[PDB]
């Protein structure tokens, strides 16, 4: 009673990726998921499934599967993992300590880096408190780092929260853009609709 394939291509092959701070999440349900297209490709620089068997994915049915897509630089990819610290994990995108899914990343220097510097991509540098897991904040209010209130970015202790990347093709690999896709596996007391090819409900 289910034959359509899950549109993983609409996320990985998407023309543009949303900024990391405003990470874009897509819900996936009512389809047959062929994960072997993902966990066998050699183009991915980082492929780590946390909490699940990465090879036995084609045998599992799930209630819903969520795919989050964004881009960061190379040295910040290590922050996309359960139990991590840093500007991306604390303020931009936080995974829970019991994250059940896969973390996928690959270099995109030939896509997201324009000649001279790509400032379209941004990321949060200052925030009041650390982000609870899977919290998506977009407030661009002036961050107050001192005892004096702020109205406008001028004056010390008043900064614009979002920081833009300087992605150029000449930048070092550690400072090059890396498209990241995070798969979240959710199972509830509900009809499991995201199954692998050789699943049990079939």
């Amino acid at each position, epitope marked *: 009673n289910i034959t359509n394939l899950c549109p993983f291509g609409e996320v990985f092959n998407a023309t543009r990726f949303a900024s990391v701070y405003a990470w874009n999440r897509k819900r996936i349900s009512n389809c047959v998921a062929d994960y072997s297209v993902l*966990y066998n490709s050699a183009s991915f620089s980082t*492929f780590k499934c946390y909490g699940v068997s990465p*090879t036995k994915l084609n045998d599992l049915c799930f209630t819903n599967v969520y795919a989050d897509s964004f881009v960061i630089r190379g040295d910040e990819v290590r922050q996309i*993992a359960p139990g991590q610290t840093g500007k991306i994990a604390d303020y931009n995108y936080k995974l829970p300590d019991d994250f059940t899914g896969c973390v996928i990343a690959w270099n995109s220097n030939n896509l997201d880096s324009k000649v001279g510097g790509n400032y379209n991509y941004l990321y949060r540098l200052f925030r009041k408190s650390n982000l609870k897991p899977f919290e998506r904040d977009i407030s661009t209010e002036i961050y107050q780092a001192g005892s004096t209130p702020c109205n406008g970015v001028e004056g010390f202790n008043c900064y614009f929260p979002l920081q833009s990347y300087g992605f150029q093709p000449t930048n070092g690999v550690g400072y090059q853009p890396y498209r990241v896709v995070v798969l979240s596996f959710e199972l509830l007391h509900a009809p499991a609709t995201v199954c692998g090819p050789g699943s049990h409900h079939h």
Partner: antibody
Amino acid sequence: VQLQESGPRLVKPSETLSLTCTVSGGSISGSNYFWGWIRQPPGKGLEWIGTIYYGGSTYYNPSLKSRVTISVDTSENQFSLKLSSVTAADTAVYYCANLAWLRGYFDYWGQGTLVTVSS
Amino acid sequence: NFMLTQPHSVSESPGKTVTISCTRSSGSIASNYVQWYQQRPGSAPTTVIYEDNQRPSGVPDRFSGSIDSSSNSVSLTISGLKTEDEADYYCQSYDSSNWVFGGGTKLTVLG
């Protein structure tokens, strides 16, 4: 109950080498595994040679991309290995192992075969 | 494009706990999974730990693997050492094009 190596042990130096790894109990046409080659000199460490997925995608060791080619045929359900222009350092016990779906750990190993290059 | 470094040799008494580190020379070790293999004298290797912490059904739970984030390395821990575990151990990882093994570790059970 799956893997076992071939029998052309002796190889003359400066010539080529050929080994085959037969897979019993399981269709190699059922491409759900990678098939790799691993060698080790007597009392030395393991070195990866190359893997092959039946979809055609091959991966070779950069130190051996000039001399190593790996094929596979479903007519007899086995994958081969070519090591051209053999040298004295290539004396090793060549294991063929099965690799699971993901590029992770080798599931099913063989028992290897020692090749020696002398005259 | 990278390598994996293992200690020369280790040694401990029976029933004790030993640790073997697998240091990566280039890149982040947390990029992909790191595995461990146990090769007894003469015979073929066998997977003990995979996915940096996972044991296949049939391997004693005495083996365990953890991560050391700062030193850019993973570690294999063997609690309750037995004389049957006296063998060579290798670590293996994959980095986007290559499967790379480590140097090796000669485990010696004392007493």
